[PDB]
Amino acid sequence: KETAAAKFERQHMDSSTSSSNYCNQMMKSRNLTKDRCKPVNTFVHESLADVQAVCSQKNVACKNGQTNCYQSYSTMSITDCRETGSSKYPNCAYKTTQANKHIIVACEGNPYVPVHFDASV
16 A cells, blocks of 8 residues: 555656646556546646655645645646546546646655645645
């Protein structure tokens, strides 16, 4: 069983890799369309070190009300994936959207690392 930190990396980190086919390929290769087409997801194109560093940056309230969320001081290169209308499982179709925004992640554990991607502002 992968750790919460490992799950975050799998679901949201892509420091290496875009095209309009990006989300269609990534959502599948990262196993986010295994038992269901995940409605939306975001990939971060920054180093693991830079994203992990966000846990010591701006503390803000999480969407669920918890207080362990942090916003990045600098904007980050990200890719937003949003499922289309004519998607329909098992052929999950996604709309790929690149953007540069600040990210908000929830952190926990020892070491204190990102475990949930809360939002992009």
